[PDB]
PDB file of N, CA and C and ligand atoms in Angstrom:
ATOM      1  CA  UNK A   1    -163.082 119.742  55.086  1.00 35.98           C
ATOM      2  C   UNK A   1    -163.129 121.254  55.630  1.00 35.98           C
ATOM      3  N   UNK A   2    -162.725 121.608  57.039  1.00 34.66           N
ATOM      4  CA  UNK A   2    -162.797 120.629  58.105  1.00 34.66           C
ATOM      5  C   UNK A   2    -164.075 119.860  58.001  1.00 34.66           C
ATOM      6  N   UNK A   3    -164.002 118.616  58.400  1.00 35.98           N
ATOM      7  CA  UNK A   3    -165.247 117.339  58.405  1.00 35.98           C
ATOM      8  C   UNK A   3    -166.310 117.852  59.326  1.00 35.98           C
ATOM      9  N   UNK A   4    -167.394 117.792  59.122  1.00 33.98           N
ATOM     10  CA  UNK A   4    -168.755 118.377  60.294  1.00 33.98           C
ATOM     11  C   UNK A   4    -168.459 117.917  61.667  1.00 33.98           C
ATOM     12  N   UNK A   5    -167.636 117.024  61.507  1.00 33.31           N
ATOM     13  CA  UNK A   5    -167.579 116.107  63.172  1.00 33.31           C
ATOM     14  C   UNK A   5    -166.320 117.147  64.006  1.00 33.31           C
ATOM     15  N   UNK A   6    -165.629 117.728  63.695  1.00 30.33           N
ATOM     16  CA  UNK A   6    -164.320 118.518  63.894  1.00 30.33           C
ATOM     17  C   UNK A   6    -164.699 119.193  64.764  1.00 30.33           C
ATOM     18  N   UNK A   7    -163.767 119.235  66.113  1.00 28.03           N
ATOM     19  CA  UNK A   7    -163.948 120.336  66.787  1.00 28.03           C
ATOM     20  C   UNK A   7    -163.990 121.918  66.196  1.00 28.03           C
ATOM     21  N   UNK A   8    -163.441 122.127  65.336  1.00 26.22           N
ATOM     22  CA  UNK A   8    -163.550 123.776  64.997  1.00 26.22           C
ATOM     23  C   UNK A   8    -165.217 123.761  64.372  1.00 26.22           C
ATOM     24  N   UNK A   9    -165.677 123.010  63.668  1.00 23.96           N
ATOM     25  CA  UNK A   9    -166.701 123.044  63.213  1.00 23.96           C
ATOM     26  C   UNK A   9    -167.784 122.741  64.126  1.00 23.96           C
ATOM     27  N   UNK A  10    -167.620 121.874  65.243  1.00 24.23           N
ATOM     28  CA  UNK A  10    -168.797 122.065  66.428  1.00 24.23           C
ATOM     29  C   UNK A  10    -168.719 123.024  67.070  1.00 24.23           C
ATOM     30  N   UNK A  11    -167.484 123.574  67.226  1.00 23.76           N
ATOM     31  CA  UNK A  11    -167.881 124.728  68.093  1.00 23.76           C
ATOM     32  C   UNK A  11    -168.545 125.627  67.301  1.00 23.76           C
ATOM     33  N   UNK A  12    -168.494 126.168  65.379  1.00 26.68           N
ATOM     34  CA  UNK A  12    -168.658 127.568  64.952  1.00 26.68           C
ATOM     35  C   UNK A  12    -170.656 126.978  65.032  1.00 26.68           C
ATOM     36  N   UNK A  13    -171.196 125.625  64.851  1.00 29.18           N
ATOM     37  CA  UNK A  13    -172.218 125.269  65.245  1.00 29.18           C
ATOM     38  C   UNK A  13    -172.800 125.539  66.914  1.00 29.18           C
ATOM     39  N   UNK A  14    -171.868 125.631  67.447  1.00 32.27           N
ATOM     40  CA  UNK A  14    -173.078 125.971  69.039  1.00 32.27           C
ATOM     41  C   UNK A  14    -172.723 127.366  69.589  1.00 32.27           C
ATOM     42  N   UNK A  15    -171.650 127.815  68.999  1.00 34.50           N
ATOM     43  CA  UNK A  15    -171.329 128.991  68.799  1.00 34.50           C
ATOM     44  C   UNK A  15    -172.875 130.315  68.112  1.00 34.50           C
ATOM     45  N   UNK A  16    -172.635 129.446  66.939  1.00 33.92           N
ATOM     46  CA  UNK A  16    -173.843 130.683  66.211  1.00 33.92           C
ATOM     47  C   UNK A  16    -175.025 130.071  66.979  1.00 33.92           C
ATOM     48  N   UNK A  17    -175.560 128.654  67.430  1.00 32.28           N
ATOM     49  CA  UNK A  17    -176.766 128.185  67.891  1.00 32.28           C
ATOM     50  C   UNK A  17    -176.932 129.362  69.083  1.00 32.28           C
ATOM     51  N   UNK A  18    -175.587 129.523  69.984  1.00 33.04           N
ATOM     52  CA  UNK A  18    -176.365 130.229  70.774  1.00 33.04           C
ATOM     53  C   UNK A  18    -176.500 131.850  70.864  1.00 33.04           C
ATOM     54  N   UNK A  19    -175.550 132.648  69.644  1.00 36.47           N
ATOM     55  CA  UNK A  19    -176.177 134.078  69.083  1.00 36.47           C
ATOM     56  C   UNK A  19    -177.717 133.787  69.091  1.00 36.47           C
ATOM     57  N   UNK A  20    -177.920 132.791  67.741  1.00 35.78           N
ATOM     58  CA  UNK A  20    -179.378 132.624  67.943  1.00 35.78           C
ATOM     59  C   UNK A  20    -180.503 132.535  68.628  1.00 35.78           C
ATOM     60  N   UNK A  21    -179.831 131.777  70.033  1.00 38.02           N
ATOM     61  CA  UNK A  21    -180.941 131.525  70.582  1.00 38.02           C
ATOM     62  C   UNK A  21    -181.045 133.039  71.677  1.00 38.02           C
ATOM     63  N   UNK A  22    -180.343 133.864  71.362  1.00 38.37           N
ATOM     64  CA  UNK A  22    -180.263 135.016  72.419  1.00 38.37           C
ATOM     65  C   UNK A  22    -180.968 135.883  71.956  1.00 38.37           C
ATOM     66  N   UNK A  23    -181.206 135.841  70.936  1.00 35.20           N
ATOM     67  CA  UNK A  23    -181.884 136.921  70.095  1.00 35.20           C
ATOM     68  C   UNK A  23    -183.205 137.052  70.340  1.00 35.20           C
ATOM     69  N   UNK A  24    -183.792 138.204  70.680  1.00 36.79           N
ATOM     70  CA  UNK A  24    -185.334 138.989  71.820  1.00 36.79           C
ATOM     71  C   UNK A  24    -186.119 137.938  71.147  1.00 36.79           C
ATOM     72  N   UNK A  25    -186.114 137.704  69.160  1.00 37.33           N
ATOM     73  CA  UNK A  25    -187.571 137.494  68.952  1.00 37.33           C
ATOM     74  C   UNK A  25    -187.509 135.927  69.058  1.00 37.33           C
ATOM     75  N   UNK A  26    -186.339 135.540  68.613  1.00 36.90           N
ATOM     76  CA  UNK A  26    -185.983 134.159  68.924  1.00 36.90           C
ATOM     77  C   UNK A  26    -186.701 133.451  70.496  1.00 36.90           C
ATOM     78  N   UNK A  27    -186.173 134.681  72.074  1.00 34.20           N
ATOM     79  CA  UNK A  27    -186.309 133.863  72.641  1.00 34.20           C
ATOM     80  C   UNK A  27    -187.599 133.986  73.356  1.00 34.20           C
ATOM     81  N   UNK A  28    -188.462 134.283  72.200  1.00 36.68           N
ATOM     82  CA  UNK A  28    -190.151 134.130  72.215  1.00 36.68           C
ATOM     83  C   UNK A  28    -190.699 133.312  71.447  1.00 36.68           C
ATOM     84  N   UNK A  29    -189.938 132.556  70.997  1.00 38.84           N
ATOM     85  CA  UNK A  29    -190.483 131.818  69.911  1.00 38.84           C
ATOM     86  C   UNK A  29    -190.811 130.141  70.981  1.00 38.84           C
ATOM     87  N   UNK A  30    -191.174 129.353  70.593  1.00 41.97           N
ATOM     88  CA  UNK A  30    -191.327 127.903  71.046  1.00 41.97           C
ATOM     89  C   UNK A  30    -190.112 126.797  71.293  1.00 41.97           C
ATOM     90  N   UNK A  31    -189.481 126.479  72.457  1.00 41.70           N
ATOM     91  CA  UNK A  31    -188.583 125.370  72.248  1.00 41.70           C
ATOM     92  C   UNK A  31    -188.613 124.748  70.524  1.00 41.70           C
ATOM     93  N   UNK A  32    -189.538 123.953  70.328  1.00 42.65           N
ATOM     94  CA  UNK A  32    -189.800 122.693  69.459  1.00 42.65           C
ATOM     95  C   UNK A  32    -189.087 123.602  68.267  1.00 42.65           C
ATOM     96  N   UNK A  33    -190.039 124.854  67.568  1.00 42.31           N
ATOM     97  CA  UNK A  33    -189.538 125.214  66.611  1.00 42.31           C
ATOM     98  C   UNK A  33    -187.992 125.434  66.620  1.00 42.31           C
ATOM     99  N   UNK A  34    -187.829 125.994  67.794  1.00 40.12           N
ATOM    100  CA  UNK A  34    -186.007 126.389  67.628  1.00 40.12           C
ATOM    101  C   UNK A  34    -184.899 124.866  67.693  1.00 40.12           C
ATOM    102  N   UNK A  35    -185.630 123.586  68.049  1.00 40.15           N
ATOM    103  CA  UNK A  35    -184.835 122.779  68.250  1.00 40.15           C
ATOM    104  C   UNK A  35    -184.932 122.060  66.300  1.00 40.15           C
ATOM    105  N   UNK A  36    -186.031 122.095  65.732  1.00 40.52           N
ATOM    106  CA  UNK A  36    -186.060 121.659  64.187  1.00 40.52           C
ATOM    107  C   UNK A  36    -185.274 122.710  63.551  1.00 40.52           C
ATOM    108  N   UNK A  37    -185.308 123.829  63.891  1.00 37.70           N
ATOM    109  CA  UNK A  37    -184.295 124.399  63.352  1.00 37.70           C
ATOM    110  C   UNK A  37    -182.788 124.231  63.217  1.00 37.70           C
ATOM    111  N   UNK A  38    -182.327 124.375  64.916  1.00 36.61           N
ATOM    112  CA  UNK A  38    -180.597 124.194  64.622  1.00 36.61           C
ATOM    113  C   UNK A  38    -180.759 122.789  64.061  1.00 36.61           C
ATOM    114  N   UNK A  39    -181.261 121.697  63.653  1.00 38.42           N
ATOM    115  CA  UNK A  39    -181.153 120.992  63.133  1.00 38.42           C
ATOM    116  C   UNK A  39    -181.056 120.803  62.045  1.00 38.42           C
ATOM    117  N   UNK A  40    -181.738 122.048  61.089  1.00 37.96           N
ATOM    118  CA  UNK A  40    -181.663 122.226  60.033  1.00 37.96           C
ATOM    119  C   UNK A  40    -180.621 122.735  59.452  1.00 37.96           C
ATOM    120  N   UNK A  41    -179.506 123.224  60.594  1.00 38.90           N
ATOM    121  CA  UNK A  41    -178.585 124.431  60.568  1.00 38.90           C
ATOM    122  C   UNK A  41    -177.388 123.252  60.931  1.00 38.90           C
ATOM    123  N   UNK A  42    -177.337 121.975  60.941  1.00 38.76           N
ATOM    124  CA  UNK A  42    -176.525 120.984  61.243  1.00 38.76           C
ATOM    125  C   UNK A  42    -176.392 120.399  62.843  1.00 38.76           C
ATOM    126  N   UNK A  43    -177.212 121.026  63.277  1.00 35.91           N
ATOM    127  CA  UNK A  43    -176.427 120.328  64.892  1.00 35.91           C
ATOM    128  C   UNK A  43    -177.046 119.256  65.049  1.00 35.91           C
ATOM    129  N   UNK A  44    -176.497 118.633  65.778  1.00 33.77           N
ATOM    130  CA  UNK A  44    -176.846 117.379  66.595  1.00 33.77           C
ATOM    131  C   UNK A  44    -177.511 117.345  67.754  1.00 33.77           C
ATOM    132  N   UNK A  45    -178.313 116.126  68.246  1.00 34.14           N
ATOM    133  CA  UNK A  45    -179.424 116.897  69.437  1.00 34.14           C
ATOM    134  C   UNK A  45    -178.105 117.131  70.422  1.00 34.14           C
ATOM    135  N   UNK A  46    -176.966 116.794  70.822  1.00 31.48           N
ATOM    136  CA  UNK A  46    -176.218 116.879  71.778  1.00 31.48           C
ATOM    137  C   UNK A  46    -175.864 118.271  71.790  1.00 31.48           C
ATOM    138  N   UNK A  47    -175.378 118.653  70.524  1.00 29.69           N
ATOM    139  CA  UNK A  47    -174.836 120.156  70.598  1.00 29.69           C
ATOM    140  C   UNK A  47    -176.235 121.349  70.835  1.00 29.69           C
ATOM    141  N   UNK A  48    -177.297 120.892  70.213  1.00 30.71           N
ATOM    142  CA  UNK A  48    -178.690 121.689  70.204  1.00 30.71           C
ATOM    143  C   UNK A  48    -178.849 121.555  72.196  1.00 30.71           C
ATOM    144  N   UNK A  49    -178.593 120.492  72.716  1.00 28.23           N
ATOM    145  CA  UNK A  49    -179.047 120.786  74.186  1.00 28.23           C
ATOM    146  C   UNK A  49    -177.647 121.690  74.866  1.00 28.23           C
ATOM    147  N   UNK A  50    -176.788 121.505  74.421  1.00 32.11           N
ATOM    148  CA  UNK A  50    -175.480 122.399  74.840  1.00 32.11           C
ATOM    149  C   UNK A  50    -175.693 123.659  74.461  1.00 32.11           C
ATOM    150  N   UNK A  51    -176.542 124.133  73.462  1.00 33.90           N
ATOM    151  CA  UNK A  51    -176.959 125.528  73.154  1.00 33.90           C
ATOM    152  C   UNK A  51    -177.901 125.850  74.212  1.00 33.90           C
ATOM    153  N   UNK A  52    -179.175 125.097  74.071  1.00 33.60           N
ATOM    154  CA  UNK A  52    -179.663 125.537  75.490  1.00 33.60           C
ATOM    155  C   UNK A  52    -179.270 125.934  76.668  1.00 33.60           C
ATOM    156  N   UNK A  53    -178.470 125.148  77.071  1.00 33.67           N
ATOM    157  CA  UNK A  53    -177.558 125.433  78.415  1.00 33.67           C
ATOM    158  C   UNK A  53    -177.160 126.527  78.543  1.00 33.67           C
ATOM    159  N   UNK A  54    -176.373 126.741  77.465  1.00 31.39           N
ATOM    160  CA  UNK A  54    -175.364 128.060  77.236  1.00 31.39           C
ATOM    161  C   UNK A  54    -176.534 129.234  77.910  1.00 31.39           C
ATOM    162  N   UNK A  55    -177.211 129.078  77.085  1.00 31.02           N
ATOM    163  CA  UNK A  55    -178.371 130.570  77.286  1.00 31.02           C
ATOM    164  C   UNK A  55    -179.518 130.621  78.453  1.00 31.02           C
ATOM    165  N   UNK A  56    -178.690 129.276  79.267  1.00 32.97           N
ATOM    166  CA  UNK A  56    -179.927 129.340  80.538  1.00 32.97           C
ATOM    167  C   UNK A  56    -181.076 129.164  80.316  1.00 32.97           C
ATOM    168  N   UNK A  57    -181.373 128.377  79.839  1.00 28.02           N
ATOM    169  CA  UNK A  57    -182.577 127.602  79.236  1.00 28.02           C
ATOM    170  C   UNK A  57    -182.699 126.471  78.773  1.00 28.02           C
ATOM    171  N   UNK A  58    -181.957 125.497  79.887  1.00 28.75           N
ATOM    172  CA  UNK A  58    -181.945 124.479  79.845  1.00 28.75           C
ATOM    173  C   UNK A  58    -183.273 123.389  78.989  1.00 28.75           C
ATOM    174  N   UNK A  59    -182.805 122.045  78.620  1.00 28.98           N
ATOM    175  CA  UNK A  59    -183.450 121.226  78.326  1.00 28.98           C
ATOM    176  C   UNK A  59    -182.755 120.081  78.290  1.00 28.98           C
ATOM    177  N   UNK A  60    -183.458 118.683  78.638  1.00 30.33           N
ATOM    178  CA  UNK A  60    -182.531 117.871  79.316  1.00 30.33           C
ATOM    179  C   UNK A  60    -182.630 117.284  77.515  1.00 30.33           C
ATOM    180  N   UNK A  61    -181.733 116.245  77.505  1.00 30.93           N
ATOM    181  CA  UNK A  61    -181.115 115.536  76.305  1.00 30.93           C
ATOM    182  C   UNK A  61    -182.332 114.541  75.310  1.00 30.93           C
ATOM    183  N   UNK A  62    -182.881 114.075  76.343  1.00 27.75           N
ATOM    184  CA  UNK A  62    -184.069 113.722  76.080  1.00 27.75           C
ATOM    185  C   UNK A  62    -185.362 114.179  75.494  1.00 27.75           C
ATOM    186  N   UNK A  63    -185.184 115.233  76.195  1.00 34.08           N
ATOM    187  CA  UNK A  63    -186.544 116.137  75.620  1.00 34.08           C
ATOM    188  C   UNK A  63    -186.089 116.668  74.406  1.00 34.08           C
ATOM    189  N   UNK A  64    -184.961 117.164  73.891  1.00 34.57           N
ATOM    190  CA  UNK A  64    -184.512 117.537  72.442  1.00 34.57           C
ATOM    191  C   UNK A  64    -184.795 116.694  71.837  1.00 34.57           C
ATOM    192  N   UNK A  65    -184.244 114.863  71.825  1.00 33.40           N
ATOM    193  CA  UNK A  65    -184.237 113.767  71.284  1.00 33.40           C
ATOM    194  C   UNK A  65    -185.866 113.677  71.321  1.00 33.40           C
ATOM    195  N   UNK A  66    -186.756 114.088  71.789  1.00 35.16           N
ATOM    196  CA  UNK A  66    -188.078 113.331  71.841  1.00 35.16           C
ATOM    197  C   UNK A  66    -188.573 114.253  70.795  1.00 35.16           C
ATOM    198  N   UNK A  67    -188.504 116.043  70.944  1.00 35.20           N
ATOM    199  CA  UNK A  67    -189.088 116.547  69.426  1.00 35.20           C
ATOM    200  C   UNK A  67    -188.433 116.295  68.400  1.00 35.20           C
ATOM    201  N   UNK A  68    -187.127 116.125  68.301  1.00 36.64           N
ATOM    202  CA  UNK A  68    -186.906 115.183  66.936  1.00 36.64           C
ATOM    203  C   UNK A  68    -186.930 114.059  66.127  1.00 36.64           C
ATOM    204  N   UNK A  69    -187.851 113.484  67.277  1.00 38.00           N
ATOM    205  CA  UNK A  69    -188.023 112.214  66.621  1.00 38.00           C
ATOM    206  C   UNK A  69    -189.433 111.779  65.712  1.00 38.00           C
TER     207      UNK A  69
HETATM  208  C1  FTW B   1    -186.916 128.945  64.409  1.00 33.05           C
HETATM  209  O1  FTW B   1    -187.125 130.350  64.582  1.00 33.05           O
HETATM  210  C2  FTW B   1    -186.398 131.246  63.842  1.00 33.05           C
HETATM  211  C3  FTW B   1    -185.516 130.929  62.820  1.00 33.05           C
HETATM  212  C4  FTW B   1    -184.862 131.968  62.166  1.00 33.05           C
HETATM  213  C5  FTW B   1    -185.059 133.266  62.419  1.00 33.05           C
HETATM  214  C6  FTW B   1    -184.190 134.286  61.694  1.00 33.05           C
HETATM  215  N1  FTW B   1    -182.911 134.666  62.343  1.00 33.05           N
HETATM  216  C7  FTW B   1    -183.076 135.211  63.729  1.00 33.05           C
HETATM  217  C8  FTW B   1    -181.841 135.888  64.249  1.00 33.05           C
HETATM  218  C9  FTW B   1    -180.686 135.012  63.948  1.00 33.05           C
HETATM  219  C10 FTW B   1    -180.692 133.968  63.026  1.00 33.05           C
HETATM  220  C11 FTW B   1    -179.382 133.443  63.065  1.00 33.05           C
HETATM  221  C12 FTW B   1    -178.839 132.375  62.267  1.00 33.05           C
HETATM  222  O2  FTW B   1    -179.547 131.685  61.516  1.00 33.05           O
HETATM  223  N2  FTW B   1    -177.509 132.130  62.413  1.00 33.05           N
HETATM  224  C13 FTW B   1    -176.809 131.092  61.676  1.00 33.05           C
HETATM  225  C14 FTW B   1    -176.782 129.790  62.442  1.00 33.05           C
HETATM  226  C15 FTW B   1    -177.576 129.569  63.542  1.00 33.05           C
HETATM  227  C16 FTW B   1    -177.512 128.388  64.241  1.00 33.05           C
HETATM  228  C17 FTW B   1    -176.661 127.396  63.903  1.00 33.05           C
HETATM  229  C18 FTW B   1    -175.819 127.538  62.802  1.00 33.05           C
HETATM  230  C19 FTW B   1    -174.920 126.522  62.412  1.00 33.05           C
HETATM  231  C20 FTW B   1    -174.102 126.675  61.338  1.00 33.05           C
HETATM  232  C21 FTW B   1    -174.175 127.852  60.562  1.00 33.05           C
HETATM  233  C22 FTW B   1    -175.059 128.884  60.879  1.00 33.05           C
HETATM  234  C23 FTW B   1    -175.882 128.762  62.030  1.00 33.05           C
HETATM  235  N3  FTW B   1    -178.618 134.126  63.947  1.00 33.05           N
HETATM  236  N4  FTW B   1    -179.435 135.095  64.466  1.00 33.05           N
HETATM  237  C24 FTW B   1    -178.928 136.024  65.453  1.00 33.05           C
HETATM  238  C25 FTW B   1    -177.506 136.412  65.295  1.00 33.05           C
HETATM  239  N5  FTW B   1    -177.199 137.108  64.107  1.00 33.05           N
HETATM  240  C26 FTW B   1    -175.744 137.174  63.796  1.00 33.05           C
HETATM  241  C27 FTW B   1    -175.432 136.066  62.807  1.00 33.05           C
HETATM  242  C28 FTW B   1    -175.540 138.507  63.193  1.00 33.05           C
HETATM  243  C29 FTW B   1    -174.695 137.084  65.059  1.00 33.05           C
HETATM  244  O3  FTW B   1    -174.870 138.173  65.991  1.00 33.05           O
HETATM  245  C30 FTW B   1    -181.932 133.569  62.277  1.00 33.05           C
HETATM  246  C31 FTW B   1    -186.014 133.643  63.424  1.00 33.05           C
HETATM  247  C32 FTW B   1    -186.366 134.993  63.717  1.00 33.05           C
HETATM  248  C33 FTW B   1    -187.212 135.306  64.740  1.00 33.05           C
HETATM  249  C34 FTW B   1    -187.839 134.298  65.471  1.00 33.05           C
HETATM  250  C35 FTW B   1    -187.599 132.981  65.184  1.00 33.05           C
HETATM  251  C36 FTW B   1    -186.665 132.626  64.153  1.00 33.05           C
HETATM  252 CL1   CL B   2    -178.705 138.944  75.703  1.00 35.35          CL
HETATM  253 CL1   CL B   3    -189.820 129.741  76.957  1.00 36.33          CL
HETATM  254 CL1   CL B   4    -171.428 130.869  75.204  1.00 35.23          CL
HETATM  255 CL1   CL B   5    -186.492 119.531  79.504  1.00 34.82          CL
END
């Protein structure tokens, strides 16, 4: 394939984003670093702030978009 844009493929992306972001040492680590990361890992800032959410640790859309820029 499926194409990166595909629903099955955004979800297995915010899916694992947010195993990740649950994880003890992970969620000691720094916003910024964890947001260059799932980026590195394919997401998009939209799906990277939908991971946040997920794990109650919000960040608004903007503020993702501003450390990646
Ligand atoms: C930016 O900061 C960090 C980056 C990386 C690490 C190392 N790992 C952590 C656990 C971790 C990682 C990952 C990890 O890298 N998962 C893969 C992945 C993540 C995000 C988006 C993806 C999108 C497409 C494909 C894979 C993706 N997952 N856990 C926890 C869950 N482990 C499994 C897979 C068994 C499910 O229960 C990465 C870090 C380790 C500690 C602190 C910071 C870390
Ligand atoms: Cl947990
Ligand atoms: Cl924090
Ligand atoms: Cl979830
Ligand atoms: Cl924020």
């Amino acid at each position: 394939g499926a194409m990166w844009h595909t629903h099955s493929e955004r979800e297995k992306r915010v899916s694992n984003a947010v195993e990740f972001l649950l994880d003890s040492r992970v969620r000691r680590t720094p916003t910024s670093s964890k947001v260059h990361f799932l980026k590195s890992k394919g997401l998009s800032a939209e799906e990277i702030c939908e991971a946040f959410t997920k794990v109650g640790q919000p960040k608004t859309l903007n503020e993702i978009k501003r450390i990646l820029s």
